[PDB]
Amino acid sequence: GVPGQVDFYARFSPSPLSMKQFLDFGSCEKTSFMFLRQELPVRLANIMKEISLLPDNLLRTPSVQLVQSWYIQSLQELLDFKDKSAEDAKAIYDFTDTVIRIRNRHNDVIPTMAQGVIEYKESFDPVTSQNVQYFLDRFYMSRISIRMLLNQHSLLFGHIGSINPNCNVLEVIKDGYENARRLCDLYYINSPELELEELNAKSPGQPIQVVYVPSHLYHMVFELFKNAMRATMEHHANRGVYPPIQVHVTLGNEDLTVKMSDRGGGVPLRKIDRLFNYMYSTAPRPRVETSRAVPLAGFGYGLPISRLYAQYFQGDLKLYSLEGYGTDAVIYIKALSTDSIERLPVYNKAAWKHYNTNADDWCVP
Amino acid sequence: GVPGQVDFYARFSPSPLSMKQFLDFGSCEKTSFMFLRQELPVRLANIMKEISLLPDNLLRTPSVQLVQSWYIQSLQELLDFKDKSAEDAKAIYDFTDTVIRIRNRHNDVIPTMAQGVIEYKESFDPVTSQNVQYFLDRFYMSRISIRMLLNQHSLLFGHIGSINPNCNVLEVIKDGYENARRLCDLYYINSPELELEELNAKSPGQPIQVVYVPSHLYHMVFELFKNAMRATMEHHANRGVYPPIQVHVTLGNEDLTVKMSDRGGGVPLRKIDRLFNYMYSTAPRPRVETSRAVPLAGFGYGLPISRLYAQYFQGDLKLYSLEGYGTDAVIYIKALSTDSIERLPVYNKAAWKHYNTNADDWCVP
Ligand SMILES: [K+]
Ligand SMILES: [K+]
């Protein structure tokens, strides 16, 4: 059975790696094969059990059925190697090929799962919508983790893979700003300027670098800029004077922090968490047949996924807004590669109970 | 039995009031009596069941035994009225006297419970210390609620009680600043200046007022100033140049926000929650027999209790710090009295399970 393969591997826990451990891999293709031939089936199988717990009307959508079919095909291909000899040179070539194969094929899972959620809302619940939120954080975090392993192995055996041991933080920030700004200019015919301030408390006046995945940092800052820009342009639309977006970067002993500050009018505290809510953030997918500029907010789960990127390596992404004034968004990244450990979801009794269960200890307002 | 009185009333839930409802009371002593003769025993009894669930070595301390004895005496005195005639003028005089009696006697519960926690740490656990954190938020929130009812009734029948329908927010802030500053000058022989900015988005350039309890707002800002000041003076000690504390007040449609910003060097994200942790924040009580200035941090649970004040009426108090640079503390208050509903703990099966129970669904770092 294919349910049997899934059940067997889902019993196991994923094995989180530190950023330092990823970095030591890039220094032996055989040592990666032995790791990944178990780890990948375990990671795939754990998340696949949760897909199965989705509301039937979500599960049954064309998009989710497509995504599930991809996971099933991927598992079966990796489980073709379970016994195949560790000493065999063809098998490891075939593995690195299968990994490269799987990586370079399904870049589309994130918007496709997001289409499934649209298909779900369109044809059809508050009880099960808590399940959807729980699942999607776990699914997308799992995906980040699985993609990380596929990317490292394909880059090394196909800068230490996708890790830059010396990630230039301000450079990434400025690239994120310029790319967001181009989109802002397109949609609003104007855009806020950037004011960038830095403090290396660790070593004052020296460049701020960390061991990091640059494309992760990019996704986070690019998405935050888009959000800051939209808030700014929509708030000050009447005045025609648009306050800059202010970014403060600090390297401390333990935390790299990127604070992004806008004067876009804020959101009250009751509402601010909606920005991280999949069911609320499920906006229409921009249509192909138009020359009209793409809006800076909408489809694609930019903010919730940005936060998952922060949290993946034990960082965080927090928003706090002052309604009527503006918003601060703060990225927290671990300054030390040894503190940077994968945050991985695991399927077990506790995960299953979350889908099948549900603060009585406080009086309701 | 006295356990029996407690059990009977603890079955009931506390009945949270809105700020608007408190305000309508002050417009009929008889209508308050009928309310409080049930509500007070219910509130006392619910919290008393949780005191009983404390670790034995905490429960048995002299200080906690004293506090429990006060709760027991208070309950017994209010339950002297349960049947006594609602139409009787002497009984209502005797009730308003009993309420006034109870209020004007035990102003000391908060440091006394905090002494109990010192006595507990001194002579004696990580499992039960989660119970202590859970209890103390609930106990101190309960206390705020019970004191509120005692204060309203004693003020009205002994500005709408302790509620000011037109609380001048900046005035309270400046009073909090000056009082903190005097203590800062005493301990550090210097202090940061205040920079105060305001925005009434609701009605631009008009004074910012809300329906609120001024002494609650005072406690919050005074405690935050002390914290901002200590961080500032201790960070910049070598330079002898001390950056101002910057406060931004905004009235929006739904939220009154007070942002307090310091350049006191911050705390990494791993540690920032310790400021709200009772067992970690349990510092030595300042000794009487000295002329040495009292430190701005230490004994008394200022920050955790400040946050309980914010949350009591559906507000919040959040900290976010940039390690190596500084910290923002944000008070969130409901702008509308009708959104301002008491947040009350309730004893039931769920509360009991919290003491007798214990994220397996994620991999540990
Ligand atoms: K598992
Ligand atoms: K109860």
Resolution of the model in angstroms: 2.0
Strand pairing report for B194-200 and B245-251: parallel
| Per-position b or e across B351-360, b if 16+ CB within 10 A of its CB | beebbeeeee
Give how far A191 is from chain B: nearest CA, Å.
23
Task: Calculate ∠ Cα A130-A136-A141, nearest 5°.
Answer: 135
Contact B361 A351 (CB under 8 A): yes
Chain breaks in chain A (C to N over 2.5 A) after: 27, 124, 158, 358
Type and span of the H or E element at A318 = strand A316-322
**Domains defined along chain A, listed by start:** 1-158 (1.20.140.20), 159-343 (3.30.565.10)
Question: Mapping DSSP to helix (H, G, I), strand (E, B) and coil, where does residue A12 land?
Answer: coil
A289 burial (CB, 10 Å; 0-12 / 13-18 / 19+) is exposed
**Is B348 one of the catalytic residues?**
no
A209 burial (CB, 10 Å; 0-12 / 13-18 / 19+) is middle
Contact B325 A269 (CB under 8 A): no
Strand pairing report for A194-200 and A245-251: parallel
Contact B320 A316 (CB under 8 A): no
CB B192 within 8 A of CB B149: no
A31 burial (CB, 10 Å; 0-12 / 13-18 / 19+) is exposed
Q: Which of B49, B106, B219, B235 is catalytic?
A: B219
Question: What strands lie across the sheet with A316-322, from one edge to the other?
Answer: A194-200, A245-251, A255-262, A326-334, A316-322
B122 burial (CB, 10 Å; 0-12 / 13-18 / 19+) is exposed
Closest CA to B222 of B337, B114, B300: B300
CA-based end-to-end distance of chain B: 50
Q: Which ligand is nearest to the CA of A47?
A: 1
CA within 13 Å, CB half, A263: 15
Closest CA to A5 of A80, A94, A62, A60: A80
Residues 6+ apart with CB under 8 A from B258: B169, B173, B221, B247, B248, B249, B330, B331, B333
**What are the contacts of B203-206 at 24+ separation with CB within 8 A?**
B203/B251
User: Quick count: other Cβ atoms within 10 Å of Cβ A35?
Assistant: 15
Give me the numbers of helices (H) and strands (E) for chain B, helices first please: 13, 7
Orientation of helix B89-103 relative to helix B29-51, angle to 10°: 40
Residues B40 and B153: their CA atoms lie apart, in Å, by 12
Chain breaks in chain B (C to N over 2.5 A) after: 27, 124, 158, 358
Residues B129 and B107: their CA atoms lie apart, in Å, by 26
User: Quick count: other Cβ atoms within 10 Å of Cβ A61?
Assistant: 22
CA within 13 Å, CB half, B145: 32
Within the 193-252 window of chain A, which residues sit less than 8 Å (CB to CB) from chain B? 199, 201-202, 248, 250-252
| Ligand 1 center to A183 CA (angstroms) | 42
Residues A214 and B134: their CA atoms lie apart, in Å, by 40
| Helix intervals (H) in A189-213 | none
Orientation of helix B29-51 relative to helix B62-78, angle to 10°: 150
CB A301 within 8 A of CB A281: yes
Sign of CA pseudo-dihedral B182, B188, B193, B194: negative
CB A254 within 8 A of CB B270: yes
Residues B73 and B91: their CA atoms lie apart, in Å, by 19
Q: Residue B348, annotated ligand binder?
A: no
Give how far A196 is from chain B: nearest CA, Å.
15
CA within 13 Å, CB half, B211: 19
Residues A248 and A258: their CA atoms lie apart, in Å, by 6
Question: Mapping DSSP to helix (H, G, I), strand (E, B) and coil, where does residue A344 land?
Answer: coil
| Ligand 1 center to A48 CA (angstroms) | 11
| Ligand 1 center to A75 CA (angstroms) | 15
CB A99 within 8 A of CB A44: no
Phi, psi of B112 (to 5 degrees): -75, -45
Full DSSP string of A18-77: BHHHHHHH---HHHHHHHHHHHHHHHHHHHHHHHTTS-HHHHTSHHHHHHHHHHHHHHHH
Contact B202 A324 (CB under 8 A): yes
Q: What is the CA radius of gyration of chain B?
A: 22
| Per-position b or e across B226-242, b if 16+ CB within 10 A of its CB | bbbbbbbbebbeeeeeb
**Is B358 one of the catalytic residues?**
no
Residues A126 and A103: their CA atoms lie apart, in Å, by 35
Closest CA to B153 of B109, B92, B108: B92
Closest CA to B317 of B329, B335, B326: B329
Contact A363 B349 (CB under 8 A): no
CA within 13 Å, CB half, B262: 27
Chain-centre distance for alpha carbon A245: 23
Residues A205 and A201: their CA atoms lie apart, in Å, by 8
Q: Which of A39, A50, A223, A342 is catalytic?
A: A223
| Per-position b or e across B278-307, b if 16+ CB within 10 A of its CB | bbebbeeeeeeeeeeeeebbebbbbbbbbb
Residues B267 and A257: their CA atoms lie apart, in Å, by 11
User: Quick count: other Cβ atoms within 10 Å of Cβ A89?
Assistant: 10
Residues A310 and A318: their CA atoms lie apart, in Å, by 10
Q: Which of A219, A235, A334, A342 is catalytic?
A: A219
